[PDB]
C-alpha cells in the first residue's frame, strides 16, 4: 500500500533522526585519540596442500587445532594444522559443495551447496569410518551457509532467499526464518548464540532471534549484495563484507552503520570478513587474491596477507586468536601468524 | 624425532594423500559439460537422448570419454551466484527452442540469456556448443508466421534455411572474445546422432586448449 | 563391532601354527591391528604390530623372525604365521584394533582370543600386585616408568586397560587423561612425567579385575606388572 510505504519511509526517517540525535560523534571521531596499531607483518606458517579444485570454506575447531574445508573436487579434508597431517579425507556425494561447518564439540561436520542438502557427517564413529549422519532436505535454493548451534540443532542460510534452523534428529527445519528480498549468502552465530545475524542479495543484513524465531532489525549501507558476515568478539557488533569493496561495521544496539573500511586502490568483491580475539583487527579476503588486515576503529589498512595465485574464498581465525588460515581457489589453504 | 603415534599419523596421511593423488588422476580425464536452456529449450529431450530438487547429474560414455552433463533447472535464484562454480568447465551446452520464435517474446529472452552467459567474465575461455532444437516444428510454423513477427528489419525471403541461418548468425553475435568458438547446430525432434556432434565439438575444443597452452593459438 | 581369532590347541614345540582374527561390523582397512599375548597367570605383552595398508610392521625382541603377521584386507582378516614355537610360546593371543590420528583412542576394542599351548626398552612397572578394596570409597593405582613419558608435542603416551576376570582387556584412559568411550566419569587418570596415578572415584562390582599401565612412546610396547582389585 502507497499509505504503508510512506509510512514504511517515515519510520526509516525516524529511525534515521533517532540515530542522528544519538550520533553526538562517529567511532573514527572517538578512536582518534587513541594509538593506532603498529604495522603488522604475518608469515605464512604452514601451507596445506592436498585438495585439486578450488576450496569454497572452511571452519575452525573449538580446539584451534582441527579445521575442516570443503573444496569442488567433492572431498572434505580435515588437516591437523599443526603438524599439516590429515585425519580425515570425506568423499562427497555431490561434490558442489560451497559451505562446510565444524561442530562445537568436534564430533559432526556439515556440508551443502547445489545439491540444496545439507550434508551432516559424524566423526565419532565406532566403525571408524565417516559417515552421513543426517541429510537435511527442504530448501528450494542452493545452500549457502551453515553454522553449528550444538550436537542436535543447526542453522543453515540457502538460497531461496531463507534461513532455516534445524534439529538434526528428527530432521525438519523446527524453526524457518523469511524476509530477505535476495539469495542470503552468510551466517553468523552471536557468542550466546540467543541471536543471529545473516547478510544476502538485497544489500541488507538483517538480525534473527534463534528462540523466537522471527527477525529484530535490519541493516542496510551497502550498495551492492553482502557475501560474508561476522559478530563482533563481544557479541554487540557485526561486520559485513559485499561486492562494492567496501566492509562495513553495524552495532545491534545503535542499529546503524558505524564505520566503513574502503580503500580508494581496491575495487574487487569481499568473499568472507573476519575479526581477531579482542576485535581490534578485521581481516577480509579479496577478490584481488590478497587479504587486507584493517584496524576496527581507524579503518586504516594496518596489514596485505599476499601469496595466494587466486581468489580467497574463505577465511578463519581460531577461539584462542593465536593464528589465521585462509582458503583460496588455487587448491592452497594456508596459515597464517 | 616423532613418536609411534606421530609416525603412524603420518602414515595415515600419506595414504590419505595416494588416494587423493589417485581419485584426481581417475577424476582428470572426465569431460565437464553445462547444460544450460531456458524453460522449454528442449533440455529434457536432448538429454533423454545422451541418455528432488539440486542440479541433475547426467554422466555418460562414448568413444573412450566419459562425459559429465550437469542440468541446473531447480536453482531459480540470481545466476551470477553460482556461475562461478563451473570455472572449468569444458564446454556450455545451450538449447533453444526454434519453434518459439513467435509464441510466448521467448526467443528475446533466450537471446538476453544467452548475451548475459556468453559475456559472463567467468565464461571466457569457454566454446558453446549451441542446440537450436524443435527445427521440424519451425518448419511449418515458418510458412503459415513469418519471422519479421518476433525480429523487425529481417528484409529476407521467408523460407526454412535462410531464417534458420538468420537465427544462428545473430546468436553467433553477442560474442565480444576472440578465444571462443560457437558450434552452431540445428535438431529436429529425434535424430539418434546429437553425441556424435557433441563429442566432435568437444575434441575440438580439447584440441584448441591444447594449442593455446602449447602456444600456437 | 567384534574380532573373531581361530587356531590354536596342543602344538609340538617343532611345529609351526597360523592363527588367524576375522574383523567384521567396522571398516578393517583403514584399522591398524595389533597382537598382544597373555601367558597363564601373567601380564599382558605386545608381540606384533602391522599398520593399514601393511605399511609398517614391528615385532618384539622376543618373537623376530619366528613370527610372521599379515593381514587381508578384502575378506577382512588378519593372520600371525609362527614359524618357530617354544615352551615360553603358550598364551592367549589377543588382536586388538588401533587408529591414529589426531584425537584418536588406539586399542580401545579388543578380540576374544585363542587359547595356545605347547607342550634398552622402556621398563613400565607399578610395584602393586594385588589391592584390596571394598566398594564405595575411592581407589588409587600407582604406575611409574623408567623412561619419561612427556614428548615433546605435549602428550604422555600412557594407557591404562581393565581386564575384568574371564573376558578380555578394555581401554579405560589414553594418554593418561582422555577417558575411552563408554567408560564411566568414575575412572580419572593423572601423573607428571615419569610417576602415573589411576584414580577410580567409587568401586563397584564389576570395577573388580586386573588394571595395566602400557606406554606407547616407542616399540616395543612394554605392559605393567598388573594390579588386581579384589574385595
Known amino acids: 500500500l502507497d499509505q504503508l510505504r510512506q509510512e514504511a519511509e517515515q519510520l526509516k526517517n525516524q529511525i534515521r533522526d533517532a540515530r542522528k540525535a544519538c550520533a553526538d560523534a562517529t567511532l573514527s571521531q572517538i578512536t582518534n585519540n587513541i594509538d593506532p596499531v603498529g604495522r603488522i607483518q604475518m608469515r605464512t606458517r604452514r601451507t596445506l596442500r592436498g585438495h585439486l579444485a578450488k576450496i569454497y570454506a572452511m571452519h575452525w575447531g573449538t580446539d584451534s587445532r582441527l579445521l575442516v574445508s570443503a573444496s569442488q573436487d567433492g572431498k572434505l579434508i580435515i588437516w591437523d594444522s599443526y603438524t599439516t597431517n590429515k585425519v580425515h579425507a570425506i568423499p562427497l556425494r555431490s561434490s558442489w559443495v560451497m559451505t562446510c561447518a565444524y561442530a562445537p564439540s568436534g564430533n559432526y561436520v556439515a556440508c551443502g551447496g547445489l545439491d540444496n542438502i545439507c550434508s551432516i557427517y559424524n566423526l565419532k564413529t565406532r566403525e571408524g569410518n565417516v559417515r552421513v549422519s543426517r541429510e537435511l532436505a527442504g530448501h528450494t535454493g542452493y545452500l549457502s551457509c551453515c553454522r553449528f548451534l550444538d550436537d542436535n540443532q543447526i542453522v543453515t542460510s540457502s538460497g531461496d532467499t531463507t534461513c532455516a534452523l534445524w534439529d538434526i534428529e528428527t530432521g525438519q527445519q523446527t524453526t524457518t526464518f523469511t524476509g530477505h528480498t535476495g539469495d542470503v549468502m552468510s551466517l553468523s552465530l552471536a557468542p550466546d548464540t540467543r541471536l543471529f545475524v545473516s547478510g544476502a542479495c538485497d544489500a541488507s543484513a538483517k538480525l534473527w532471534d534463534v528462540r523466537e524465531g522471527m527477525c529484530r532489525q535490519t541493516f542496510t549501507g551497502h550498495e551492492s549484495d553482502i557475501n560474508a558476515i561476522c559478530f563482533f568478539p563481544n557479541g554487540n557488533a557485526f561486520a559485513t563484507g559485499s561486492d562494492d569493496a567496501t566492509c562495513r561495521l553495524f552495532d545491534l544496539r545503535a542499529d546503524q552503520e558505524l564505520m566503513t573500511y574502503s580503500h580508494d586502490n581496491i575495487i574487487c568483491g569481499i568473499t568472507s570478513v573476519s575479526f581477531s580475539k579482542s576485535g581490534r583487527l578485521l581481516l577480509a579476503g579479496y577478490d584481488d587474491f590478497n587479504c587486507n588486515v584493517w584496524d576496527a576503529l581507524k579503518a586504516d589498512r594496518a596489514g596485505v596477507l599476499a601469496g595466494h595465485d587466486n581468489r580467497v574464498s574463505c577465511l578463519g581465525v581460531t577461539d584462542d586468536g593465536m593464528a589465521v588460515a585462509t582458503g583460496s581457489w588455487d587448491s592452497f589453504l594456508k596459515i597464517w601468524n | 624425532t616423532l613418536s609411534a603415534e606421530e609416525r603412524a599419523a603420518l602414515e595415515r596421511s600419506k595414504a590419505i594423500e595416494k588416494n587423493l593423488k589417485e581419485d584426481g588422476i581417475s577424476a582428470a580425464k572426465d569431460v565437464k559439460l553445462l547444460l544450460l536452456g531456458a524453460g522449454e529449450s528442449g533440455k529434457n529431450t536432448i538429454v533423454k537422448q545422451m541418455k528432488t530438487t539440486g542440479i541433475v547429474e547426467t554422466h555418460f560414455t562414448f568413444k573412450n570419454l566419459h562425459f559429465r552433463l550437469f542440468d541446473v533447472g531447480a536453482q531459480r535464484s540470481e545466476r551470477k551466484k553460482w556461475i562461478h562454480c563451473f570455472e572449468d568447465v569444458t564446454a556450455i551446452i545451450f538449447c533453444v527452442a526454434l519453434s518459439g520464435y513467435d509464441q510466448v517474446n521467448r526467443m528475446h529472452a533466450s537471446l538476453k540469456l544467452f548475451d548475459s552467459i556468453c559475456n559472463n567474465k567467468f565464461f571466457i575461455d569457454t566454446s558453446i556448443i549451441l542446440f537450436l532444437n524443435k527445427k521440424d516444428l519451425f518448419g511449418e510454423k515458418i510458412k503459415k508466421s513469418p519471422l519479421t513477427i518476433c525480429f523487425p528489419e529481417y528484409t529476407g525471403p521467408n523460407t526454412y534455411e535462410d531464417a534458420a541461418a538468420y537465427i544462428q548468425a545473430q546468436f553467433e553475435s553477442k560474442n565480444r572474445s576472440p578465444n571462443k568458438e560457437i558450434y552452431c547446430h540445428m535438431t529436429c525432434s529425434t535424430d539418434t546422432n546429437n553425441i556424435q556432434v557433441v563429442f566432435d565439438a568437444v575434441t575440438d575444443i580439447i584440441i584448441a586448449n591444447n594449442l593455446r597452452g602449447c602456444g600456437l593459438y | 563391532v567384534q574380532l573373531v581369532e581361530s587356531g590354536g590347541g596342543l602344538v609340538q614345540p617343532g611345529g609351526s601354527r597360523k592363527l588367524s582374527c576375522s574383523a567384521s561390523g567396522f571398516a578393517f582397512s583403514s584399522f591398524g591391528m595389533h597382537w598382544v599375548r597373555q601367558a597363564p597367570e601373567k601380564g599382558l605383552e605386545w608381540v606384533a604390530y602391522?599398520?593399514?595398508?601393511?605399511?609398517?610392521?614391528y615385532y618384539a625382541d622376543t618373537v623376530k623372525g619366528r613370527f610372521t603377521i599379515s593381514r587381508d584386507d578384502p575378506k577382512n582378516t588378519l593372520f600371525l604365521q609362527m614359524t618357530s614355537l617354544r615352551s615360553e610360546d603358550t598364551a592367549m593371543y589377543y588382536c586388538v584394533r588401533s587408529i591414529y590420528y589426531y584425537g584418536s583412542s588406539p586399542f580401545d576394542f579388543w578380540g576374544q582370543g585363542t587359547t595356545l599351548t605347547v607342550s634398552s626398552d622402556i621398563v613400565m612397572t607399578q610395584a602393586t600386585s594385588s589391592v584390596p578394596v571394598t566398594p564405595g570409597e575411592s581407589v588409587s593405582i600407582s604406575c611409574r616408568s623408567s623412561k619419561s613419558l612427556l614428548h615433546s608435542n605435549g602428550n604422555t603416551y600412557l594407557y591404562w586397560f581393565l581386564q575384568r576376570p574371564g573376558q578380555s582387556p578394555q581401554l579405560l584412559i589414553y594418554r593418561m587423561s582422555n577417558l575411552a568411550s563408554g567408560v564411566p566419569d568414575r575412572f580419572s587418570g593423572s601423573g607428571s612425567g615419569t610417576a602415573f596415578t589411576l584414580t577410580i572415584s567409587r568401586l563397584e562390582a564389576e570395577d573388580v579385575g586386573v588394571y595395566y599401565c602400557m606406554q606407547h612412546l616407542e616399540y616395543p610396547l612394554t605392559f605393567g606388572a598388573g594390579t588386581k582389585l579384589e574385595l
Open positions: 602391522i599398520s593399514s595398508g601393511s605399511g609398517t610392521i
